[PDB]
Amino acid sequence: DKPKDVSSITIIPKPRLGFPHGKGKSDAVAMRVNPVALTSFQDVSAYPDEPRTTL
Amino acid sequence: DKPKDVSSITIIPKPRLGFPHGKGKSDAVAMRVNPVALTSFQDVSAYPDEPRTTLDIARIWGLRSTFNWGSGDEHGKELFNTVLDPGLRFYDQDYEGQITPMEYVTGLYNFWSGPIELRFDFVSNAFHTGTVIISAEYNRSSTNTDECQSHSTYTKTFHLGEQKSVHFTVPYIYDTVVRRNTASAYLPVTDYDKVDNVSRAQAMGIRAESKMRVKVRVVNVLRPVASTTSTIEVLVYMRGGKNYALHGLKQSTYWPSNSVVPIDSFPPDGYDP
Amino acid sequence: DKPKDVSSITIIPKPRLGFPHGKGKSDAVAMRVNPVALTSFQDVSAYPDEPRTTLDIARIWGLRSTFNWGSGDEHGKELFNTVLDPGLRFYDQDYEGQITPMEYVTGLYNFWSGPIELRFDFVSNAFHTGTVIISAEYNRSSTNTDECQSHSTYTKTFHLGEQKSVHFTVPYIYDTVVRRNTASAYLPVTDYDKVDNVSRAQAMGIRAESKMRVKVRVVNVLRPVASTTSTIEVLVYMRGGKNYALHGLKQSTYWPSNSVVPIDSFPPDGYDP
Amino acid sequence: DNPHRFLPANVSNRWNEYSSAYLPRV
Amino acid sequence: EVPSKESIQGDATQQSSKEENTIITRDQQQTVSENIPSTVGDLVIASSEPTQQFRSLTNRWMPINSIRVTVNGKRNDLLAQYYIPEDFLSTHAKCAPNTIPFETYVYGKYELEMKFVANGNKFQCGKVIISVKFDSYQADNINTGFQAALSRPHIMLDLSTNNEGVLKIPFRYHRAFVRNQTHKTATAGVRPGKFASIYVQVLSPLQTGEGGANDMFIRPFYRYTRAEFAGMSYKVPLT
Amino acid sequence: MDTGAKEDEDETANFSDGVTAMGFQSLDTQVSIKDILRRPVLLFNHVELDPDYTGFFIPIMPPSRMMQYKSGDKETSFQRLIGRTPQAAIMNLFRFWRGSLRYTIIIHSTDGHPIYVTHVPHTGNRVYGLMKVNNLHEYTKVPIFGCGLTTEMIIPSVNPSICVEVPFDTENNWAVTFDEDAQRNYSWRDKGDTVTGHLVVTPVVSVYMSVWVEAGDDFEVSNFYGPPSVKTNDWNYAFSDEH
Amino acid sequence: MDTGAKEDEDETANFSDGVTAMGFQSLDTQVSIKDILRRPVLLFNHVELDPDYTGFFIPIMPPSRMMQYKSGDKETSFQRLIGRTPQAAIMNLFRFWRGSLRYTIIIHSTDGHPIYVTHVPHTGNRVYGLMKVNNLHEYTKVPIFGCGLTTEMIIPSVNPSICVEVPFDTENNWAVTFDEDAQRNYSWRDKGDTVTGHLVVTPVVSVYMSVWVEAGDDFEVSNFYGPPSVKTNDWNYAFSDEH
Ligand SMILES: [Ca+2]
Ligand SMILES: [Ca+2]
Ligand SMILES: [Ca+2]
Ligand SMILES: [Ca+2]
């Protein structure tokens, strides 16, 4: 069968996702084999005595 | 309140939905008052005895060929000999006539497979008597004068008498699970262009001609009584076996050759005499 | 009724889905009747003994080099001495030949790590006798005439006799968790362009040449009986250790050097003799 | 013409591939 | 695996292989390649009719041509090479009963085993490698060195220890069956009788001592462990 | 459909029926007649739309011999390979069809002008191409898309293509697929029973369009006619694998 | 594949096997052969499509030595680095492949003209580039995309790119990856076993396109051949870290 699909939605186009923000979401595409793999901080990570905020 | 909506998603734009497919989804918009109403098949619908698949059609017996058998045909003589390729009846000449249902439908695909069924109907009476041997020969073929080479294959010997018909299932024995059609997948020639080798070198493919043959040879010379005809016609029917398969839709190898007139505008195009 | 639909979402348009990735999602449209049907691997499928990863391939023993050992080679003499860099066999000359499986596959990555395995096969017989010492030297190297400097590293002394082969695991000891390949990540040169320093200054990177070496020195001079050959060949095999790792896909450093002919159109390009 | 089309007769079999009898190919 | 002290007949600790009406003994150890699978599932579809086996004829050991190894052989040199089943039908051991079924069936699936027996003496030395390349038609001249051999299913022979080697060859072809014979009436569009190649190559040159022999010999033996035939036809002479 | 099995009275032994190869290479089975008829067929390849006409008419009928090109006959705006498509070949076996058809229309443009597609139910005629309804000389003041009939619009700058499904708006139980002679002048009410209406495309400015057709989801064929006389000359246009 | 472990009979002591570094920097492991073959390879970089031809043919076959450029040989429309991509290097080790391939086609345009991509199943030939099928001189009346074969369309004004997955429509169990000589004239049916069909791109007006290929999800390789003879001259084109 080849039934018609009547689902639809109106959309508002924007060029970037979260461009001004320091947090939230990003639409960045990973230059990796696996789109969701990330850098590991299991062994090498920020030392606890390093400052975390400007305060 | 007028809260901001932060939901979003990245999208990939495409012009059509399901354009190449025969099933799945369609984004068709109905030219109806109700976008989801459909045609009713509650009362008027396809009759259950109509074919539903091309394989159903391939299962319809069709008259493929005919040949004569006379009291003058000596033992071992080939009464029938043909390459059994459902893709093309001839590799060296045009075909025009009433192609069988299975060949017609096979002409829509690039691949076929499975056993093929044959039925030999002897148009005789109870006073005709004789014996023939039907053989399916693969890869390598027999000499027209060497009956023994035919007898070494897949054979069925039929004792013609009170019964005037015999069924024969042609085994599918090849080095590939399916066979590719010998006809073309696309032929843009429409005006019977006189062909040359450049045209052929630039065809859609290369014809993988079959060497598989089915032959019928005389075992016991036909010996009808003097009072009846000394030569009878034998009808050869053909159709796909129950496990016949088809795949790879392509340009139809066969096309209507009789009473073909394209439509014109009615009544604008001079229908008003 | 024809109620308004107030649902909406903001979208970010992109031309392709998963273009750079080797896994994840794809927006590919199937050229099939059924948009979700797939190729069947029920009967025809990859054999279980075929390699599944590049690390599997790196675990195949390959003949790396060969060297001779004769009764004339005095104690301490280097019979074999090489920089053990799976990235490049030479830093000063072209390479042409049958590269080992592990080097071939390492040539597809910008980083490698883990122990490397070597196997020395002495092509001798029970009448050859002698002793050699294999050493893995890091950071700083030994003088060709100072056997003691080699003896101060990671060593394995092999007593050649009835057994004609010895395995050696080369430790991975570096100041980084992985090492970067010495070959290039991208080389656009295709016509053996005579190189100059401007070309080099504008290369894709800077070759971090390795100083790590593996040497084989004579401990006890080979003393075969007079009736047999006084010099034997030693085959040096190499492959990645069980914890060998590879990362950073790049342009392959190696390419076919034998019988390379690009395809042409068949049969259009003059196949019709 | 194209030298790749046909293998010289002395190194090939009737199928235009190296003969299994021709050991020097390597 | 373990030798014994000498007695009247020396160190009597040989092992042997008996297949049908053929036996082959070995004086030392033997190296064997892995037992690997062939494609299964296409047989019942490519052939509507039942396929056949004739084990008593095909599963016996048959020696083929003798191989000479000399001190002049260089690494990578081809000592011998076989296109199978073709070369076992029309060039080597042509009168072998193992070839009988190929005279009447046009198609087949074949799984073989090849045993190699060498005889170099205790003052000689050298290494030979035998490997198989599946579906090699028109690809024999690439991936054909000792390196490719060491990567594909192979066996290694040491010329002074005389260990035996057994290469197990499954049926891996791009079609369901391989064609058994060429024929004046058969198509020329498909080269038949070849689903694989076997190469015997020098890994390390044979060497000998002062006044020693400058050569030694190796003998290959084959047997089908599984030969299935399809498509009966009249019998024909092989190639 | 009558298989003819009724005439096969032989009951002697036969060779095996084997095992089907369907699904061995893949699960994409392509033998369902409806599946085949649901894939698009090109009718018009880059034809012109002229605003001086009411619009370009598309008769609602599936592909068949009714649109087959014959070497030597007058040139029409129909693409020449329609008669050899698998779906036309199938339709040439069934003289009845009921249900909707889907038309994919592409306007070769990126302008912001709306192009309208208007549906006309079964009215008795059967025409195609540009036509001036009632032979007037201006249609922008009396547009067919503004008369009350169901109409849809295409705006090329948003999407130059559209897929519309036309209903089975006719008085008959079934639509007649084909005639032996598409140009014979016979009883006029019967003449128009091979279509279920028309689709009319009207532009603002001159522009080109392409049209494809396929069966809708609510669609059935029947009245199997058996195969017609056919021809083929494929063999002559290719080499065999033996040179 | 035979590891050769069978020939390593030494059982004396060795140094440690250590701990793997895989996953230490990140979890993006790149050693899976199928993962590697699923990332795109550029075949044609900005090549021309001419409407005077049937279309531009793309033989369905993965990247390998069959497309390798050799300094000095005739210029083809294939990009010159295909033979050194990781996936071509992998394919040069496997002579069998089965399954689908995915083609990413980009039309350098923003026009509203539809560009069609037609799939041709295995027919026996192996061609690439612009071709006039059967050597005719006009194809708009007999378009390959309107003959019945599976076809998809690209409309640049909406999206100049598309990704199509072609099936494994062939009679063989496996497709043959490569030959020792891609130009040798040998048994014709065998010659065509290195492809599973073609993809044909047909424009309305002259325009350029780029093509990438990758393995589909339903894809397998086999018949490991071991490594071939190779070469490299990388060393000569860069400085070392010691000047
Ligand atoms: Ca029965
Ligand atoms: Ca049975
Ligand atoms: Ca240990
Ligand atoms: Ca340890």
**DSSP class per residue in B177-215:** SSEE-SS-S-----S-----HHHHHTSS--B-----EEE
- Residue E42 one-letter amino acid: D
Closest by Cα among G150, G155, G151, G133 to G142: G133
Residue C212 to residue C174: CA distance in whole angstroms: 9
Nearby residues of G205 by Cβ (< 8 Å), 6 or more positions away: G51, G111, G113
In the block, tokens 């014109």 appear at: B264
User: Strands, DSSP E only, in G113-181?
Assistant: 115-121, 129-131, 151-154, 161-166, 175-176
Q: Contacts of residue E210 in chain C, CB cutoff 8 Å?
A: 226-227
Nearby residues of E72 by Cβ (< 8 Å), 6 or more positions away: E214
- For C226, phi and psi rounded to 5 degrees? -55, -30
Nearby residues of E168 by Cβ (< 8 Å), 6 or more positions away: E32, E33, E34, E35, E36, E112, E113, E153, E225
Task: Report residue E158 CA to chain centroid gap.
Answer: 18
Alpha-carbon torsion G198, G201, G206, G212, what sign? negative
| Under 8 Å between Cβ of G40 and G213 | yes
| Under 8 Å between Cβ of F100 and F230 | no
- For C232, phi and psi rounded to 5 degrees? -125, 155
Nearest-CA distance B125 → chain A (Å): 51
Q: Contacts of residue B196 in chain G, CB cutoff 8 Å?
A: 135
Residue F1 to residue B53: CA distance in whole angstroms: 12
**Regarding beta strands E22-26 and E15-19, do their DSSP bridges make them parallel or antiparallel, or are they unpaired?**
antiparallel
* Residue B227 falls in which region: left (phi positive, over 0), alpha (psi -120 to 50) or beta: alpha
In the block, tokens 């004569």 appear at: B68
| Under 8 Å between Cβ of B195 and F236 | yes
| Under 8 Å between Cβ of B213 and B35 | no
Lookup: tokens for B216: 């019928």
**Regarding beta strands C130-137 and C213-220, do their DSSP bridges make them parallel or antiparallel, or are they unpaired?**
antiparallel
Strand-by-strand arrangement of the B116-123 sheet = B62-70, B231-240, B116-123, B165-170
The chain E residue lying nearest C98, using CA atoms, is E147
Structural Rg of chain G based on CA atoms = 21
Task: Report residue G179 CA to chain centroid gap.
Answer: 15
With H, G, I as helix, E, B as strand and everything else as coil, classify residue E51: coil
What b/e sequence results for G214-242 when a residue is b if at least 16 CB atoms lie within 10 Å of its CB, and e otherwise?
A: bbbebbbbbbbbbbbbbebbbbbbbeeee
Instruction: Reply yes or no: is the peptide bond before residue C267 cis, omega within 30 of 0.
Output: yes
- For F132, phi and psi rounded to 5 degrees? -100, 95
Strand partners, F219: F99
**DSSP category for residue C203:** S
- Residue F114 one-letter amino acid: P
Task: Report residue B24 CA to chain centroid gap.
Answer: 29
- Residue E201 one-letter amino acid: Q
Cα–Cα–Cα angle for E158, E163, E168, nearest 5°? 100
Q: Contacts of residue E44 in chain F, CB cutoff 8 Å?
A: 18-19
Residue F81 to residue B252: CA distance in whole angstroms: 10
Closest by Cα among F89, C26, B103, C47 to E40: C47
Residue F169 has a CB neighbour count (10 Å cut-off) of 18
Nearby residues of E217 by Cβ (< 8 Å), 6 or more positions away: E66, E67, E68, E69, E118, E119
Residue C220 to residue F198: CA distance in whole angstroms: 100
Tell me, yes or no, if B154 comes closer than 8 A to chain E by beta carbon. yes
Helix (H) or strand (E) holding B233: strand B231-240
Lookup: tokens for G221: 């390789």
Helix (H) or strand (E) holding B68: strand B62-70
Closest by Cα among B204, E194, D6, E174 to G186: D6
- Using CB atoms within 10 A of its CB, is residue E52 exposed (0-12), middle (13-18) or buried (19+)? middle
**Regarding beta strands B29-30 and F161-166, do their DSSP bridges make them parallel or antiparallel, or are they unpaired?**
parallel
Q: How far apart are the first and last CA of chain A?
A: 63
Lookup: tokens for C171: 């430790």
**DSSP category for residue G68:** -
Lookup: tokens for B6: 């932060």
Structural Rg of chain E based on CA atoms = 19
| Under 8 Å between Cβ of C105 and C218 | no
**DSSP category for residue G137:** S
Nearest-CA distance A43 → chain B (Å): 34
- Using CB atoms within 10 A of its CB, is residue A41 exposed (0-12), middle (13-18) or buried (19+)? exposed
| Under 8 Å between Cβ of E235 and B152 | yes
Strand partners, B8: C10
Nearest-CA distance D9 → chain C (Å): 17
What b/e sequence results for G4-27 when a residue is b if at least 16 CB atoms lie within 10 Å of its CB, and e otherwise?
A: beebbebeeebbebbebbbebbee
* Residue E155 falls in which region: left (phi positive, over 0), alpha (psi -120 to 50) or beta: beta
CA separation, residue A17 to residues A8, B49, B65, C12, E5 (Å): 22, 58, 71, 7, 84
Lookup: tokens for C4: 């308004």
- Residue C258 one-letter amino acid: N
**Regarding beta strands B130-137 and B116-123, do their DSSP bridges make them parallel or antiparallel, or are they unpaired?**
unpaired
Q: For chain G, where are the alpha helices, taking DSSP H only?
A: 33-37, 86-91, 188-191
**Regarding beta strands C8-13 and B8-11, do their DSSP bridges make them parallel or antiparallel, or are they unpaired?**
parallel
Residue B68 to residue B79: CA distance in whole angstroms: 7
With H, G, I as helix, E, B as strand and everything else as coil, classify residue G133: helix
CA torsion, ordered C188, C194, C200, C205, to nearest 10 deg = 30
Q: Contacts of residue D5 in chain G, CB cutoff 8 Å?
A: 183-185
- Chain C residues bordering chain F (beta-carbon distance below 8 Å): 32-34, 37-40, 42-43, 267, 272-273
Of the partner residues G26, G35, G39, the one whose CB lies closest to the CB of residue A40: G26
Lookup: tokens for F38: 């649901």
Nearby residues of B270 by Cβ (< 8 Å), 6 or more positions away: none
- Using CB atoms within 10 A of its CB, is residue C243 exposed (0-12), middle (13-18) or buried (19+)? middle
- For C198, phi and psi rounded to 5 degrees? -70, -40
List all chains that touch chain E, counting a touch as 3 or more CB pairs closer than 8 Å: B, C, D, F, G
- Using CB atoms within 10 A of its CB, is residue E22 exposed (0-12), middle (13-18) or buried (19+)? middle
Count of CA atoms in the C-beta half-sphere (13 A) of E104: 16
In the block, tokens 């045009």 appear at: B94
User: Strands, DSSP E only, in chain C?
Assistant: 8-13, 29-30, 62-70, 78-83, 95-97, 109-113, 116-123, 130-137, 154-160, 165-170, 179-180, 213-220, 231-240, 245-249, 255-256
Helix (H) or strand (E) holding B149: helix B147-151
| Beta-carbon separation of C21 and A13 below 8 A | no
Instruction: Reply yes or no: is the peptide bond before residue B267 cis, omega within 30 of 0.
Output: yes
Q: How far apart are the first and last CA of chain G?
A: 42
Closest by Cα among C204, C149, B119 to F14: B119
**DSSP category for residue E101:** G
Residue G243 to residue G241: CA distance in whole angstroms: 6
Method: X-ray
Cα–Cα–Cα angle for G76, G80, G84, nearest 5°? 140
Closest by Cα among C86, C111, C119, C50 to C245: C111
CA–centroid distance, F14 to ligand 1, in Å, is 5
Lookup: tokens for E225: 């462990």
Residue D9 to residue E172: CA distance in whole angstroms: 30
Lookup: tokens for B99: 């192609």
Of the partner residues A9, A14, A31, the one whose CB lies closest to the CB of residue C8: A9
- Using CB atoms within 10 A of its CB, is residue C192 exposed (0-12), middle (13-18) or buried (19+)? exposed
Nearest-CA distance A4 → chain G (Å): 18
Helix (H) or strand (E) holding E24: strand E22-26
Residue B160 to residue F38: CA distance in whole angstroms: 48
| Under 8 Å between Cβ of G127 and G73 | no
Resolution of the determined structure in angstroms stands at: 2.1
Lookup: tokens for B212: 């598989």
- Residue B196 one-letter amino acid: D
Alpha-carbon torsion F172, F177, F182, F184, what sign? negative
Residue E206 to residue E72: CA distance in whole angstroms: 8
Its domain, for residue E32, covers 1-239
Strand partners, C118: C168, C238
Task: Report residue C233 CA to chain centroid gap.
Answer: 23
Lookup: tokens for G145: 């995309």
- Residue G26 one-letter amino acid: S
Lookup: tokens for B178: 């399916």
Residue G196 to residue G62: CA distance in whole angstroms: 10
Residue C18 to residue A35: CA distance in whole angstroms: 8
Cα–Cα–Cα angle for B75, B79, B84, nearest 5°? 130
| Under 8 Å between Cβ of F239 and B60 | no
CB pairs under 8 A between B and F: 356
**Regarding beta strands F161-166 and F115-121, do their DSSP bridges make them parallel or antiparallel, or are they unpaired?**
unpaired
Total tally of structural domains belonging to chain E: 1
Considering every ligand atom, which ligand is closest to the CA of G11? 3
Nearby residues of A18 by Cβ (< 8 Å), 6 or more positions away: A24, A25, A26, A27
| Under 8 Å between Cβ of E138 and E83 | no
**DSSP category for residue B151:** H
Instruction: Reply yes or no: is the peptide bond before residue F51 cis, omega within 30 of 0.
Output: no
| Stated length of chain A | 55
Lookup: tokens for C140: 């700083």
Q: How far apart are the first and last CA of chain F?
A: 42
| Stated length of chain B | 273
CA separation, residue B117 to residues B103, B135, B244 (Å): 12, 13, 10
Residue C224 to residue E209: CA distance in whole angstroms: 10
Q: For chain C, where are the alpha helices, taking DSSP H only?
A: 54-58, 101-106, 147-151, 197-201
Closest by Cα among C35, C39, B47 to A2: C35
Nearest-CA distance B99 → chain A (Å): 31
The chain E residue lying nearest F20, using CA atoms, is E45
| Under 8 Å between Cβ of G7 and C60 | no
- Using CB atoms within 10 A of its CB, is residue E153 exposed (0-12), middle (13-18) or buried (19+)? buried
- Using CB atoms within 10 A of its CB, is residue F27 exposed (0-12), middle (13-18) or buried (19+)? middle
**DSSP category for residue E50:** P
**E151, E152, E169, E202, best to mutate vs chain C, most C CBs in 10 Å:** E151
| Under 8 Å between Cβ of C207 and G238 | yes
Closest by Cα among B198, E56, C248 to G26: C248
What b/e sequence results for C43-77 when a residue is b if at least 16 CB atoms lie within 10 Å of its CB, and e otherwise?
A: bbbbbebbbebbbbbbbbbbbbeebebeeebeebb
CA torsion, ordered B86, B88, B90, B93, to nearest 10 deg = 160
| Under 8 Å between Cβ of F88 and F192 | no
